[PDB]
């Protein structure tokens, strides 16, 4: 059904999802061909204000957001196929315009 | 970081999820390690009428919900491991208690 850019090779999925920011972020755990674990996350479209404590991995497999960093000058857009590293101790803004589909590891 | 009983064998997971249901639910498409190919879903807790043109398995990985065909005269739990065939072409109601993971197929 789906072409293979549409899709991520994978091992296993977990079966169990967890719900976040009043119902508007979803993660189930996933285990990727390459036998490394990452969270599977669905972000909705609005704005977020978040911080990390561990520095995360944000590969983004679809949607659009701006990302900005509380000391920054200016926003990063997140496309498809964009990578980047939040360092840990972050606070930050997402700002997801198309929901945002995204494997974080940390 | 998964338990064997905590995860699913997979091959392929789709990167864009589909929400629907005014954000009640959302969707995206996963390949078993079988090959075969599903509708992996969490739907949020509330009560929803759903239908289908062709019949579809359900295999619940984690949560809770009443199943209540169209016109049945009392409802059916399905908790985490149940699967049964849903029959096409009736308007059958899913009460999410604990927000549902599940396997759609067919
Ligand atoms: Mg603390
Ligand atoms: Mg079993």
């Known amino acids: 059904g789906m072409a293979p850019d549409q899709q991520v090779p994978a091992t ?6 967890r719900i976040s920011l009043d119902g508007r972020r979803s993660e189930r755990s996933v285990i990727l061909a390459d036998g490394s674990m990452h969270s599977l996350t669905l972000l909705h479209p609005g ?31 997140l496309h498809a196929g964009d990578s980047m590293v939040i360092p840990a101790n972050q606070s930050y803004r997402l700002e997801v315009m198309e929901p945002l589909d995204y494997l974080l590891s940390s």
């Open 12 to 17: 296993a999925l977990g079966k169990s999802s």
């Open 47 to 77: 704005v977020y204000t978040l911080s990390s404590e561990v520095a995360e991995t944000i590969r983004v497999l679809s949607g659009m957001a701006y990302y900005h960093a509380e000391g920054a000058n200016d926003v990063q857009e």
